[PDB]
Design a binder for this molecule. Structure first.
Ligand SMILES: *[C@@H]1O[C@H](CO)[C@@H](O[C@@H]2O[C@H](CO)[C@@H](O)[C@H](O)[C@H]2NC(C)=O)[C@H](O)[C@H]1NC(C)=O
Ligand SMILES: *[C@@H]1O[C@H](CO)[C@@H](O)[C@H](O)[C@H]1NC(C)=O
Ligand SMILES: *[C@@H]1O[C@H](CO)[C@@H](O)[C@H](O)[C@H]1NC(C)=O
Length: 411
């Protein structure tokens, strides 16, 4: 039974606790949901960080992790999830249906093979070796999120347990891997013993559709939010890119990878406007508006060559966002997982490496453009100051990664 084809009827979905939201078409709406959480969570994460600190994460990964957890959710815990991750914005739907749409979203995201640009997703459950897990939870987790259940000796050998998990992450999350994201959820019982660990991996390998030439790269000044500056490696190139100059100076620019399914969007505000303001103003609706107004346009592209990485606890922000019960040893309601449970820890680790090739291994490459004469009055895009970055799947319109480049300088 292939999920990709299977209809809603074919895949039962024996849901323990069902919840009705207030008042491909579905797959498209889930992406909106997923994107609403993304930008929101980013704003929270941003306010908790310093302006000149880089930010990077994969919100798709996060949504997926907590969607998996939602499988056993019940009562308020269930609702809070549906609300915090905006799953309830798919008007008049139900807990279990969200998982059908995710099965579809995943298919068109990962199963659809044919690269030049590679997007792979790996999910695994690591549950206590000596417990009896609910078979519906098992099956559905496997079916929908392709997550298998591996037993570990959490009780008597937590040390070796951690090793087992890491040996697996390494085999998945860093062939070369220049961009990835890892999400870990620790589920514990009232006794402070690890019952289950949810692990989500997503990583991307993509060659620029219009690659820069290393020969044209040169050390130049990047201007930090602290008013100082440092030496960045500026990549350079001229060409046809989807672009748009929106509200008060802000430049939006799309750089697609080979395949055209996956692209990198940059958001670069004028020198006199702070990235902070833009971040605060970045509502899901505005963002969508910007992506639409994008039109091909010959221009020059000055963009630094960088490697950013990030790591943070999901707990605080998620709580402030409404997700309380799930972390509350007393309130946490996840009955559908074992035949109590609460989330003790939820951390996220990610990094993105970009260069003349794209999200790929640096290479000794050159470029020759022969009979070209471009209007001396063309637009220029010089990212020598902090700018946002998304890596979205266009067809499905989902934000795979996102972050901020506040300092690309390597020193
Ligand atoms: C695992 O949880 C599932 C719900 O996700 C339970 O399945 C239900 O079981 C009850 C009684 O056994 C049936 O009346 C329902 O038809 C089943 N489905 C639903 C959606 O409720 C199941 O009981 C649990 N299994 C174990 C071993 O605890
Ligand atoms: C949770 O939902 C169940 C049935 O879905 C219901 O019986 C119960 O009253 C709700 N609240 C609690 C605290 O169990
Ligand atoms: C992961 O391990 C498998 C063996 O199951 C091996 O075939 C594969 O090459 C490894 N992948 C990476 C990225 O190391």
């Amino acid at each position: 039974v292939d999920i990709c084809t299977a209809k809603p009827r074919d895949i039962p979905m024996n849901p323990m606790c069902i919840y009705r939201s207030p008042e491909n078409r579905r797959v498209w709406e889930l992406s909106k949901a997923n994107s609403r959480f993304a930008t929101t969570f980013y704003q929270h994460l941003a306010d908790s960080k310093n302006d000149n600190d880089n930010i990077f994460l994969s919100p798709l990964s996060i949504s997926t992790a907590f969607a998996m957890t939602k499988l056993g959710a019940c009562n308020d815990t269930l609702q809070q999830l549906m609300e915090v991750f905006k799953f309830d914005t798919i008007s008049e739907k139900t807990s279990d249906q969200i998982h059908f749409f995710f099965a579809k979203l995943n298919c068109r995201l990962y199963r659809k093979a044919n690269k030049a640009s590679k997007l792979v997703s790996a999910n695994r459950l690591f549950g206590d070796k000596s417990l009896t897990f609910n078979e519906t939870y098992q099956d559905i987790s496997e079916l929908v999120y392709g997550a298998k259940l591996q037993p570990l000796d959490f009780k008597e050998n937590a040390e070796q347990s951690r090793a087992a998990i890491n040996k697996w992450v390494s085999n998945k999350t860093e062939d070369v891997i220049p961009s990835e994201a890892i999400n870990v959820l620790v589920l514990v019982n009232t006794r402070t013993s690890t019952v289950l660990v949810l692990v989500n991996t997503i990583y991307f390998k993509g060659l620029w559709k219009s690659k820069f030439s290393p020969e044209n790269t040169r050390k130049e000044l990047f201007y930090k939010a602290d008013g100082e500056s440092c030496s960045a490696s500026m990549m350079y190139q001229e060409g046809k890119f989807r672009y748009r100059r929106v509200a008060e100076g802000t430049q939006v620019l799309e750089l697609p990878f080979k395949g055209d399914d996956i692209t990198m969007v940059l958001i670069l505000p004028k020198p006199e406007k702070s990235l902070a303001k833009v971040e605060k103003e970045l509502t899901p609706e505005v963002l969508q508006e910007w992506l639409d107004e994008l039109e091909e346009m010959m221009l020059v592209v000055h963009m630094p060559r960088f490697r950013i990485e990030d790591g943070f606890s999901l707990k605080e922000q998620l709580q402030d966002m409404g997700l309380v019960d799930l972390f509350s040893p007393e309130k946490s309601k996840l009955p559908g997982i074992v035949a109590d449970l609460y989330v003790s820890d939820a951390f996220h680790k990610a990094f993105l490496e970009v260069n003349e090739e794209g999200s790929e291994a640096a290479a000794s490459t050159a470029v020759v453009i022969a009979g070209r004469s471009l209007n001396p009055n063309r637009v220029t895009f010089k990212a020598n100051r902090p700018f946002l970055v998304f890596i979205r799947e266009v067809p499905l319109n989902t934000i795979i990664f996102m972050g901020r480049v506040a300092n690309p300088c390597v020193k």
